[PDB]
Design a binder for this molecule. Sequence first.
Ligand SMILES: [Ca+2]
Length: 312
Amino acid sequence: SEFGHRTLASTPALWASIPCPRSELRLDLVLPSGQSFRWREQSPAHWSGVLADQVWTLTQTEEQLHCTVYRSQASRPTPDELEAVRKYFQLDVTLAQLYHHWGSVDSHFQEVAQKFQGVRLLRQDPIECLFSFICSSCNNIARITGMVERLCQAFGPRLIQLDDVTYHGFPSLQALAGPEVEAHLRKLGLGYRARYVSASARAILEEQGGLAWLQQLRESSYEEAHKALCILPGVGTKVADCICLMALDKPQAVPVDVHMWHIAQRDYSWHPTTSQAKGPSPQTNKELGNFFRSLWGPYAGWAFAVLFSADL
DNA sequence: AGACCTGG
DNA sequence: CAGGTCTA
Ligand SMILES: [Ca+2]
């Protein structure tokens, strides 16, 4: 009872709730959908992972988001810890309002949205997001999830152990910039991605002014943030957009890839106007990005996440 | 337009 | 072959 991952039923006194309807958030649609790769459904409807440097288990009912944190001396989450959860799901951004706006300017969105409510954007830490997505090229969610997990066990601080699962905080820049990190990462199967992780860690710390340079990009504009991220090795337009959208508060960022094309072509009969090439390319991808921004508005990135989930 | 790294 | 990135 006092051991293993908790459940709302097994340790009722250790859970605290945050008012939140399923219409504003659906854990099963957000946590394993390629935004964050650190969440696991260790027990049906119960999701565990690291948030604000601690381990949490989350589960929801129709009107509540039940949270539980593991630190010593067991205890229900404090009002301040709960705010960290609220900020992580950016609960201040009302989904009902967004769905309504996107649904009123886009018939197709309104159709698919009906069955997929609760899809919103997580507000992730810049470092975790940068290196997690550096590992995203040529990999599916499952592979990415594995690489990120071994990377954290290897270079991340040990937090606590639940059952046979030991949680680790995400690796720091210092750790990732360490010597022989690349060789070590290759043994963990990160392949050529190992080099970018090592190279980007050292580049930020030794050429850009460190952690401050990254975090500070949140106060910077989307165009400026995107441009800056792109100098880092292993980070291109795609990864830069994912980072801007997921960690730098740039909701208008749309990460274009082949999947997005499939949707643009099938559900909007979209095709390139500016660039010559009629297939995916830097110039055409830039258009697709502008197309959806023009269609959905300031939160075009959030809107696509919805379609991205409806397409499973 | 290839090369870079591996399981499904 | 997979959500891409880098380079000729
Ligand atoms: Ca780059």
